Design a protein around this ligand. Structure first.
Ligand code: GSH
Ligand code: GSH
Ligand code: GSH
Ligand code: GSH
Lengths: 240, 240
């Protein structure tokens, strides 16, 4: 490398031993099409940023490998390495909500550019990250995944009540608004609607929460799922 | 107001009907000394930013009032109004992790100033907001608050296992590091250590998680609780 640049080398990141980069000039996404993974693929599809997706398979415990954990020591998807990071260096990152803020800043898309609006966006991303995701996820556990040994439905009922409470927050926020921040679709929507979708789809919790009681949520969710970039992001990484 | 500035008027914010501002030139904090509330009071005490604390009492359901909910429609503490906000206007904000990022940016303290470091800080705040807080909180419910009607200890055991897993992430991260981001104490520490403290103190879950198995965590926690600004922040708002 005396006279010119090498092709992008990501070998400093041990995760690349397990999922080699065919396109090391592109952001590398290590994910699975779950509500948290699709936040990031949807963001990438919306913004048009090139990326190389890699399927992290739970059936083979891929997320528990040293290779995966070298990128995310929390053992969870999604995670990224952007080869074209700040200060001209690769940037590893995990936590879906952090990735959304990073990506919005990188190219100045899908976050308000005024300061107050930016902090409001971060607030609603935090609401999702600390409320929607954790609590809808616990309902999914107790309704869908928990076996017959959990005979007591009190934990389920706790998370039904909390999920309804959170849906009510969203419902009131969306009154008179197209999207969570008003007219402009943003990372707050990308963080939140995949979880509403999962709750009432995959988790089969739509009857428990009575989704029809939240007409603004139903409006915005229907709009969200129909966006072509959302449809693309929901199917990435490809399972086959 | 023809010839000069009025004293700061926060009357546009209905929360001020319930907790009037004696010092409307200061950031207004609506909180209670819980792990999430003290993140913000600790940050304020660390940075030296003036603030006026207001005790939001759960015994009188203050957080469920229209006045409180006009600021945080999610009905939770902490929440703030900074009268001296971006663009010279007051800034309302909720979600502890969002407030921490706002405050660090406002005065350029306790977040790295280089881009990569900033995103790493946001990542670890997200780890706390989506992992530590929600999961330690569910353990607190099932261990401390849940009554005898929850005879099945399977939910408790689920959150014990998850809390131990999260403590292990923190433990490995702190190996060879003073604080979560290395040498420099930051908002990542402020977000996280109040929750470790609460888990092993108020929640009485220290035996369940065997805190002594996490010597780096014990080191950093002991350092954290001894900081004079932490001691001040843990006692704000004052209950009497
Ligand atoms: N707070 C994290 C949560 C990520 C998360 O829950 N990831 C799940 C899939 S949706 C995962 O990787 N689970 C694997 C496991 O727990 O072993 C984020 O938003 O990124
Ligand atoms: N270890 C997890 C495995 C399942 C999992 O990771 N679920 C994700 C969704 S794909 C979750 O609930 N994440 C919570 C969040 O996003 O905060 C569990 O036992 O629930
Ligand atoms: N994700 C929120 C969580 C805040 C939270 O859980 N607040 C609790 C106290 S620590 C609360 O106000 N609970 C009142 C209630 O649920 O009614 C944040 O970090 O600010
Ligand atoms: N409505 C809550 C009341 C208690 C509460 O708000 N707890 C807070 C701690 S003070 C919590 O667990 N917050 C979770 C987080 O921070 O994510 C519950 O039923 O657990």
């Amino acid at each position: 490398n005396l006279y010119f640049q090498s092709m992008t080398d990501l070998s400093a990141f041990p995760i690349t031993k397990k999922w080699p980069a065919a396109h090391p000039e592109r952001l590398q996404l290590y994910s699975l099409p779950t509500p948290n993974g699709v936040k990031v693929s949807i963001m990438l599809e919306e913004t048009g940023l090139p990326y190389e997706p890699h399927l992290v398979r739970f059936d083979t415990n891929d997320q528990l490998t040293p290779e995966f954990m070298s990128l995310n020591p929390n053992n969870k998807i999604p995670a990224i390495i952007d080869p074209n990071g700040p200060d001209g260096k690769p940037l590893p990152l995990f936590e879906s909500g952090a990735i959304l803020i990073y990506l919005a800043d990188k190219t100045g898309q899908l976050i308000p550019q005024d300061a107050a609006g930016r902090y409001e966006a971060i607030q609603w991303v935090m609401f999702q990250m600390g409320g929607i995701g954790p609590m809808f996820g616990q309902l999914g556990f107790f309704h869908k995944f928990a076996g017959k040994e959990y005979e007591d439905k009190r934990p389920r009922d706790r998370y039904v009540a909390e999920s309804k409470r959170l849906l009510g927050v969203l419902e009131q926020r969306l009154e008179g608004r197209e999207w969570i921040l008003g007219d402009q679709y943003s990372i707050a929507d990308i963080a939140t609607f995949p979880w509403v979708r999962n709750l009432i789809g995959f988790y089969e919790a739509g009857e428990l929460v009575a989704i029809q009681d939240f007409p603004n949520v139903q409006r915005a969710l229907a709009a969200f799922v129909a966006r072509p970039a959302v449809v693309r992001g929901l199917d990435s990484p490809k399972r086959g």
